[PDB]
């Protein structure tokens, strides 16, 4: 009674196609839906949390000290931080933002860099931390960083320093293929003055660095995510 045609692409098996399929248990009430806290609808609220950054991961075996940026006394106009802002590579790879951006593809959005001091109450220091945009060669000292968009937010009365990281569109998005190009962004910190330790301190103090994404974040295409060239078929 109903005439119909064929379509090329018959017997097709798209893996990815959303088609309603009939039920093997057509009449079965499941265990009913209850309310449990922390309901999630999006990975944006997953990556809204400042995790931490391993910056002092320059020791061989991985320990707790991988996150402690070491601060000594009587050093000024010299290096504290320094990083390429290529998330999914280098030191940002093993953050939660790390494997999330390793999951997808081309991304967009501003960030929320945070920074926090671990030292004595009666200690003071001035730390210039500077951002240089992608496509610009990063500064070589405290001088050239100060001519950049320098941030002090000093140590001695304030511990938690947050700086937003504005995003700039390059070729419409961010390159997500493995290269060591140097146009990803650059953040680094310098002693504006020497660290003033309290008397008979005799050691080191440290900083703690966090990273996350502002609500402006964007994730566009999805990828396979090998990361180990993965194949294990072990079942029990």
């Amino acid at each position: 009674g109903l005439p119909t045609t064929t379509l090329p692409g018959s017997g097709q098996f798209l893996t990815t196609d959303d088609r309603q399929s009939p039920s093997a248990l057509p009449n079965y009430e499941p265990t009913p839906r209850i309310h449990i806290p922390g309901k999630v609808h999006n990975l944006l609220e997953i990556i809204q949390v400042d995790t931490l950054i391993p910056m002092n991961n320059t020791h061989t075996k991985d320990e707790v000290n991988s996150y402690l940026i070491p601060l000594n006394a009587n050093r000024q106009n010299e290096q504290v931080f320094g990083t390429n802002l290529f998330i999914g590579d280098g030191v940002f790879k093993t953050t939660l933002l790390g494997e999330i951006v390793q999951y997808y593809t081309h991304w967009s959005g501003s960030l929320r860099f945070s920074l926090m001091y671990t030292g004595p109450a009666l200690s003071s220091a001035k730390l210039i931390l500077a951002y240089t945009p992608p496509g610009a060669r990063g500064p070589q000292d405290r001088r050239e960083a100060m001519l950049g968009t320098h941030v002090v937010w000093d140590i001695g009365l304030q511990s938690t320093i947050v700086m937003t990281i504005p995003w700039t569109s390059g070729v419409q998005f961010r390159y997500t293929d493995p290269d060591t190009y140097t146009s990803a962004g650059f953040l680094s910190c310098w002693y504006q003055t020497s660290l003033i330790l309290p008397p008979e301190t005799t050691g080191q103090v440290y900083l703690l660095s966090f990273i996350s994404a502002c609500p402006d974040f964007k994730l566009r295409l999805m990828k396979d995510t090998q990361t180990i060239s993965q194949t294990v078929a072990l079942t029990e």
Partner: protein, 230 residues
Amino acid sequence: FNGSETDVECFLGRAACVHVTEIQNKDATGIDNHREAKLFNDWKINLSSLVQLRKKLELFTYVRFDSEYTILATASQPDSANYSSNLVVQAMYVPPGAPNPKEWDDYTWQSASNPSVFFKVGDTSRFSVPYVGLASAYNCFYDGYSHDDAETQYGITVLNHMGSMAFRIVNEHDEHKTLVKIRVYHRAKHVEAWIPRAPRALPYTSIGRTNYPKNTEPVIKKRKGDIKSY
């Protein structure tokens, strides 16, 4: 955006190859190759095999599925030549809390209320098994044993079992060789996740037990030089 790209439903709802297997049908007993991978196969479904070696689901703690197993069966023995003459394959979703076949010509292929399908080799079959969970969500990441009493098995926690797939052939006549490869693709619908969880460092070493493997290599990368970048 309210677009289903970075949400949870698009995140886990893709279809992935789990449980490659290879069966045949020969005779009642015939040549002594009966039990291991021939004449039938049971899986005891567990997404613990190759959801990228348990990663995106392990990123959360509590999930709820609505599964769509799409069984792709094919004739490894040259289908182009023959070895496909009405080779009807029988799949079967044995629900949790039901006895498992361990023989090809066994009673629980035809028993009562065990959802079994039949399709031609080289074609597919689409399911929709609802959320068969003991708890209100799938406890993918659970702390606790089953009892302080008799205690079922161990903290593998197979109490929130999902099911058990069984595959076999309804055919006869040992004079010849055939071989059938069966490849099931799980797809989860209406995925509701809860309680985000920090990701693993290594690829795992066990199913169910959250053990981190010994003898590890450094999962994090050394700086290229010093804290001085570039």
